Amino acid sequence: TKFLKIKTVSSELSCREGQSYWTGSFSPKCLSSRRCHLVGECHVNRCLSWRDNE
Amino acid sequence: TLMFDNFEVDFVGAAVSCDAAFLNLTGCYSCNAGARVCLSITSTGTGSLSAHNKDGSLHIVLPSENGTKDQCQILHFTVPEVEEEFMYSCDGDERPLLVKGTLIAID
Amino acid sequence: FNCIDWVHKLTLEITDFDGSVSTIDLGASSSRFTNWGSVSLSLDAEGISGSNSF
Amino acid sequence: FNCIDWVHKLTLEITDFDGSVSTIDLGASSSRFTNWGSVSLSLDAEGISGSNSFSFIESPGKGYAIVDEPFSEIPRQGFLGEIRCNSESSVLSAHESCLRAPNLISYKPMIDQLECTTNLIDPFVVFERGSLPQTRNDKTFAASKGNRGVQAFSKGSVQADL
Amino acid sequence: EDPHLRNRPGKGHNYIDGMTQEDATCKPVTYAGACSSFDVLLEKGKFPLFQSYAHHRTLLEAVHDTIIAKADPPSCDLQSAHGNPCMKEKLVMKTHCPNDYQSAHYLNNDGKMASVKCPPKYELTEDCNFCRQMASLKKGSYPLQDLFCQSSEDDGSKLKTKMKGVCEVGVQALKKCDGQLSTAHEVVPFAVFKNSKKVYLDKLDLKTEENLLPDSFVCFEHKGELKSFDISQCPKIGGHGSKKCTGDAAFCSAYECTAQYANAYCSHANGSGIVQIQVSGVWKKPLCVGYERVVVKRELS
Amino acid sequence: EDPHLRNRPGKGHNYIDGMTQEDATCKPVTYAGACSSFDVLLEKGKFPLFQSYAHHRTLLEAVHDTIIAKADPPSCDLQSAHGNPCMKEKLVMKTHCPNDYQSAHYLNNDGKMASVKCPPKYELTEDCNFCRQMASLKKGSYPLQDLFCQSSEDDGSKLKTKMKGVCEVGVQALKKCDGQLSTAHEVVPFAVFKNSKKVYLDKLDLKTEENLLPDSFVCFEHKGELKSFDISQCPKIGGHGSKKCTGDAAFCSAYECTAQYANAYCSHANGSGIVQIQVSGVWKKPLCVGYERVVVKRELS
Amino acid sequence: TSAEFSFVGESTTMRENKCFEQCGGWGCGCFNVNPSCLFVHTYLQSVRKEALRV
């Protein structure tokens, strides 16, 4: 006579995850760089209409 | 649901002897839990003790070792005054053993 | 993350015939492969609805 | 599949003058081809209306079934048909031509361990739960006695002209 | 950074008894020469696993390193009399043979190394069953699998093929199939352990862990990209040796660099380590995980 | 369609009595040569039914294979005085054939072999109803129909043409139309069974299966292009034969698996052997089913 | 029009060409496990003797 014991811990209700993402705290670090007008790339039109990807 | 996919199970015929002793009984009857029984199995070798009642509805299999160890499982009953006599056998020859204990009513 | 359903998980400790001990779990109707075979949860009833608002 | 219209089908055989017997069928106002002319039905009989909110299950070589649930054209989760195909070989072998719902396989990455558990709906539970014959209103839905397809047994008379 | 595809660790031998005529350019295996049993292993779009596992041993290198046992006979003849024992286990092996090659080896279901060949002048056909008349005969052994060998002695005699829906694969009788059999060819991986048979598995899980093994680095020779250099001649850490060789933090963390007094720029090999397979939910150490096409007789009735 | 266009199994003879002037290139029929009685059968947009089923024999090939008998006379003279037997059976057929032709074979009513013959050097016209005096004249015949010969053992003498509302269709005459008669140019397929006549049918339903006959299996030998080989020499299971041969599961399931002692690589045909037709509801295998273009004379009164 | 029914020709009557999927294998008359096909060339015909102008 041999048994196949299947011990039961407890009755739990696990949650079914789906859409997940990671998040956290951050801190921006700005840099200052002032250049006079008509020197290299210091212009009025180039400063007002500037692209973030460039 | 337990599904088997061709699993070979072997067994070695043990020939050791062990004398079981009753300890206590605390639990319930006709409930989901059951009744925890305490047994004192005293053998001289590492084997497996097999026990059963009279009609063949209850079966107790406990690991037998070298020395005096306190083992036991959870049994189910439908009477608060349990007076069923068990027949334990360590290798084939059964021995008389009577158990007792007061149970409580719980679902 | 979030949750869409409360899967009733039952942590089972499968004890083989030779003496091997393996702790697994079963939820809803999934199965877990073992050495002897594969156990799975059958009929269920315990369930909690209303997890999309958390 | 589902049923959009109940066509009054009558299994009628044709015993020719020489002795040959040809078994055919007639539905609503259909026609066939025989070895001596053409048979057709002029008037139907009864007519079950309202079946868009019901679906049937057909098993190859086995009985039929009925489901008390409206049909859905989009494969969504929790519906009888979240993973569909187009043929039996596309299901028994899981062909890439079938459709499925996005984000269905739950992944649990554990560094070097992978466990993919899906809560797939077993169709055999509904097939064995609601299997024909089933008592629905005054009619009695049952299996077919000839061509592959869902049929219905009525309790009226036969009022048709050939 | 990128490991080479020709630097064979260990002995680097690819020859077998009876067809060892290519030992002049295949013992060892380096840039000099052209071994017939290694040119088809680096073909793009043919054996992706061998290209992914660069610094890893093969079947023949495992045979020469006393890892995989040898069959009897290890090199049988195709046009010989009294039948051919190397055909009952090869006919169910759905492979492909191009041209030129005369002999071909395969990992049988007995866990040994078996190979067949034809007497001159006969070569292999489109599969490699019988011989035919035709240019040159490359005296070697055309590989028919895509397995990799490794130095391991993990015992695994308590694990056998336990596939679902498979009645009898290859020549090993699995379960008793009382019904019919669906004789057809398909794709399925496998894994061979120590003191066991060719255990077939439907799914597998590969694991790679980087260590400080000498076979996990590569160096480029130079005076004192580029060409390769023998890494076994590099000294160890806290000592000396034959020649010299420096590197970065990965190569210098295990050995010792001499900077300007070195002759080889060592670097980390991006593709090595110990590869372990997961069978029955337990991580084990395999010896030859391939991916061929066998005839699987599934159920039908 | 079928890939085997010029390859003809068995004998492959396409010559009739009286026009034996093309046996140098049409006996047998291979990829080379120039047989006038076979090149027009593979033309695109002309006889698609022959292009769909090309693994079976033709009409003349069925005659030479002791399948289709010969009429009397087998090749009538389309120029002899005092009339000729091949006249009424030709004026009722509306078929087109190019110039520079002398003979044009077709199917009679008894299912035998009836053809015409033009003495040299008389050529035909656009319709072929009458010959006329004379680039190069073709040394053969022109198939006026689109049928293929095959071996079958299904009786169908009681399955006579049951075309209702039609007086005389094709060549046969169902009755004697004494009142009104409607003559129109309509296409009607035909079918010939065992020990029957030219039975005409309305719709055509094809069926493709396989069997165990050697005609449903092809094989080729390996030597130093494609080289055909006689597949009938393959021994059976537990029997005898001539040259051995092996193949896959389809070819090995019919014959005996030899592999190591085989001389060729046998394969399976692309669906050929048994072609059944759907007539009277059941499925029967005809002998020479086709799809000709004749004149159907329907009734009116 | 498929190659299986191209022997009829470009007809001037009402017709349609449908392609239905059918199972393959040795159980239906094939030598490969890939699914076969069923070419359908159904054309409309008139079975009456007169006509009506509605």
Coordinates of C-alpha atoms in Angstrom, one line a residue, chain F residues 69-201:
Chain F
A69 CA -9.9 -1.7 -80.2
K70 CA -9.6 -0.8 -83.9
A71 CA -12.5 -0.1 -86.2
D72 CA -13.0 -1.3 -89.8
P73 CA -11.4 0.2 -91.6
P74 CA -9.1 1.8 -88.9
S75 CA -7.9 4.5 -91.4
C76 CA -10.4 5.2 -94.1
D77 CA -9.3 6.9 -97.4
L78 CA -10.5 10.5 -97.6
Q79 CA -10.0 10.7 -101.4
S80 CA -11.1 7.3 -102.7
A81 CA -13.9 7.1 -105.2
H82 CA -17.4 5.8 -104.7
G83 CA -17.7 7.6 -101.3
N84 CA -15.9 6.7 -98.1
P85 CA -17.0 5.5 -94.6
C86 CA -15.3 8.5 -93.0
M87 CA -17.7 11.2 -94.2
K88 CA -20.9 11.3 -92.1
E89 CA -18.9 11.0 -88.9
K90 CA -16.8 14.0 -90.0
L91 CA -19.4 16.4 -91.4
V92 CA -21.2 16.3 -88.1
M93 CA -18.1 17.4 -86.2
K94 CA -17.2 21.2 -86.1
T95 CA -13.5 21.1 -85.3
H96 CA -10.5 23.2 -86.5
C97 CA -7.1 22.0 -87.5
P98 CA -4.1 23.8 -89.1
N99 CA -2.9 23.3 -92.6
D100 CA -0.2 20.9 -93.9
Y101 CA -2.0 17.9 -92.4
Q102 CA -3.0 14.6 -94.1
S103 CA -4.8 12.6 -91.3
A104 CA -7.1 13.5 -88.5
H105 CA -8.1 10.7 -86.1
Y106 CA -11.1 10.8 -83.8
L107 CA -13.5 8.5 -81.9
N108 CA -16.3 6.6 -83.7
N109 CA -19.5 5.3 -82.1
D110 CA -18.4 1.8 -81.0
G111 CA -15.5 3.2 -79.1
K112 CA -13.0 1.6 -81.5
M113 CA -10.3 3.4 -83.5
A114 CA -11.6 5.2 -86.6
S115 CA -9.5 7.6 -88.5
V116 CA -9.0 9.1 -92.0
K117 CA -6.0 9.0 -94.4
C118 CA -5.0 11.4 -97.1
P119 CA -2.8 10.0 -100.0
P120 CA 0.4 12.0 -100.7
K121 CA 0.5 14.7 -101.3
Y122 CA -3.0 16.0 -100.4
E123 CA -3.5 18.4 -97.5
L124 CA -6.5 19.2 -95.4
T125 CA -8.4 22.5 -95.0
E126 CA -9.4 24.6 -92.0
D127 CA -12.4 22.4 -91.0
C128 CA -10.9 19.1 -92.3
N129 CA -14.1 18.0 -93.9
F130 CA -12.4 17.6 -97.3
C131 CA -8.9 17.3 -98.6
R132 CA -7.2 19.4 -101.3
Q133 CA -4.1 19.5 -103.4
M134 CA -0.8 21.1 -102.2
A135 CA 5.6 24.8 -96.0
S136 CA 6.4 21.2 -95.0
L137 CA 3.6 18.6 -94.8
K138 CA 3.2 16.9 -91.4
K139 CA 4.1 13.2 -91.3
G140 CA 1.3 12.3 -88.9
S141 CA -2.3 12.8 -87.7
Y142 CA -4.1 15.6 -85.9
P143 CA -6.2 14.8 -82.7
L144 CA -9.7 16.0 -83.4
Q145 CA -10.8 15.5 -79.8
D146 CA -9.4 16.0 -76.2
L147 CA -9.5 12.6 -74.5
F148 CA -7.0 10.4 -72.7
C149 CA -6.8 6.6 -72.5
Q150 CA -6.7 4.7 -69.3
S151 CA -7.0 1.1 -68.0
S152 CA -10.2 0.4 -66.1
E153 CA -12.4 -2.6 -65.2
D154 CA -15.8 -1.0 -64.6
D155 CA -18.7 -2.2 -66.6
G156 CA -21.1 0.4 -68.0
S157 CA -23.1 -1.0 -70.9
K158 CA -26.5 -0.1 -69.4
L159 CA -25.4 3.5 -68.9
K160 CA -26.5 4.7 -72.3
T161 CA -26.8 8.4 -73.2
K162 CA -29.9 9.8 -71.6
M163 CA -29.8 13.3 -73.1
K164 CA -33.4 14.4 -73.0
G165 CA -34.8 16.8 -75.5
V166 CA -32.0 16.1 -78.0
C167 CA -32.6 14.3 -81.3
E168 CA -29.0 13.6 -82.5
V169 CA -26.0 14.6 -80.4
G170 CA -22.5 14.3 -81.7
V171 CA -22.4 11.3 -84.0
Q172 CA -24.9 8.8 -82.5
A173 CA -28.6 9.1 -83.3
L174 CA -31.1 8.6 -80.5
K175 CA -34.1 8.5 -82.8
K176 CA -35.3 9.6 -86.2
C177 CA -36.4 13.2 -86.1
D178 CA -39.3 13.6 -88.6
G179 CA -40.7 16.9 -87.4
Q180 CA -38.8 20.0 -86.3
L181 CA -35.1 20.1 -85.7
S182 CA -32.9 22.7 -84.1
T183 CA -29.3 22.7 -85.2
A184 CA -26.8 24.6 -83.0
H185 CA -23.1 24.6 -82.3
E186 CA -22.8 23.4 -78.7
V187 CA -20.1 21.7 -76.7
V188 CA -21.0 18.4 -75.0
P189 CA -18.5 16.1 -73.2
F190 CA -18.4 12.4 -73.7
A191 CA -17.3 9.2 -71.9
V192 CA -16.6 5.6 -72.9
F193 CA -17.0 2.7 -70.4
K194 CA -16.1 -1.0 -70.7
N195 CA -18.0 -2.8 -73.5
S196 CA -20.2 0.2 -74.2
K197 CA -20.6 3.0 -76.8
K198 CA -19.7 6.7 -76.9
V199 CA -21.9 7.9 -74.0
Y200 CA -22.4 11.6 -73.9
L201 CA -22.9 13.5 -70.6

